[PDB]
């Protein structure tokens, strides 16, 4: 199939979480959330992430509570039956920008911004892909490419024509920790944050794997030894034949 239709192969960046012994970089997760809140959240929902999961990961119990309360959620009807709202709590899920699919398409030229809760696992290339896509918008499409109205060119997206325009620009966000908010830095951060959204068990999973693999390896080496011992009599057994006389 043509290279354009396949899409450009995303290269391998040196993510700090790559490697069997590596945990996520939680500061990057913290920053990634800000980028999501200030840029992405305007078009992208994050339905599968509950406020409480942020606590102890990227924010404090207090910080998350304040963030949740900034949003209103449907509450149980009053004594008389009329509906009523309520500020958000930790048990709630991060709210999305649109009330339904139809409203989301209307605000994006008929396109549907996917939920990003699993985006890292729902694409070949994972982090490398997401990052490359965000930082791979050329100022102008390659010569000869007839780009449809309302579309944008990105070599990493299959078919090259994507409905999402470049949204990351240098210093469009003021990092709380003072870090220079360059486009590649912001992309590196949201992507790390999105990987955590999709794989919240990451750090703990690799820790358990370490113990599991050590125990099993030992058990394996040990069983070999035990087997050889239990078989030594059979392996070294010797036969002699003396043809019986008639």
């Amino acid at each position: 199939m043509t290279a354009a239709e396949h899409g450009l192969h995303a290269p391998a960046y040196a993510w700090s979480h790559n490697g069997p012994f590596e945990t996520f970089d939680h500061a990057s997760i913290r920053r990634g959330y800000q980028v999501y809140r200030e840029v992405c959240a305007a078009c992208h929902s994050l339905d599968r992430v509950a406020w409480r999961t942020l606590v102890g990961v990227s924010h404090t119990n207090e910080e998350v509570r304040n963030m949740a309360e900034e949003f209103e959620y449907d509450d149980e009807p009053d004594e008389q039956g009329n509906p009523k709202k309520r500020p958000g709590k930790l048990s709630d899920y991060i709210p999305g920008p649109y009330p339904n699919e139809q409203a989301a398409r209307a605000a994006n030229q008929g396109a549907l911004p996917p939920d990003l809760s699993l985006i890292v696992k729902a694409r070949h290339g994972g982090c490398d892909y997401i990052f490359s896509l965000l930082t791979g918008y050329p100022d102008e499409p390659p010569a000869g490419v007839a780009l449809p109205p309302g579309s944008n060119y990105n070599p990493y997206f299959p078919g090259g024509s994507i409905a999402m325009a470049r949204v990351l620009f240098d210093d469009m966000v003021e990092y709380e920790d003072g870090t220079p908010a360059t486009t590649s830095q912001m992309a590196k951060d949201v992507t790390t944050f999105l990987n955590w959204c999709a794989e919240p068990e990451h750090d703990e999973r690799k820790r358990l794997g370490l113990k599991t693999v050590i125990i099993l390896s030992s058990l394996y080496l040990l069983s070999i030894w035990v087997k050889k011992f239990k078989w030594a009599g059979i392996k070294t057994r010797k036969f002699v034949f003396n043809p019986p006389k008639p």
């Binding site: 059979i234 010797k238 002699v240």
Partner: protein
């Protein structure tokens, strides 16, 4: 119990093999044997032998298939590049 059909395997004492005579076997307790460490110097050069006789039966058919795969793949890559769009229209439909 109910009558059982004849098979080609019995049990200890009546395995179904031919009558053995003249064969004498010897063995030594694993306890009296040299603890697992001797499987080297004496059992190392001897090993790897049971794949020196077999590797050709595996390698040749493997080679034939890897080459056939590589060839078809590289040809597909050519067909979908600029240089081969002419040949593509020819061999396609």
């Amino acid at each position: 119990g109910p009558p059982s059909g004849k098979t080609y395997m019995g049990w200890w004492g009546h395995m179904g093999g031919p009558k053995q005579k003249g064969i004498t076997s010897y063995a030594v307790s694993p306890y009296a044997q040299k603890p697992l460490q001797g499987i080297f110097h004496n059992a190392v050069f001897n090993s790897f032998r049971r794949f020196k006789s077999q590797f050709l039966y595996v390698l040749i058919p493997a080679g034939i298939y890897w080459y056939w795969w590589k060839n078809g793949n590289e040809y597909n890559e050519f067909l979908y590049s600029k240089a081969g769009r002419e040949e593509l229209e020819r061999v396609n439909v």
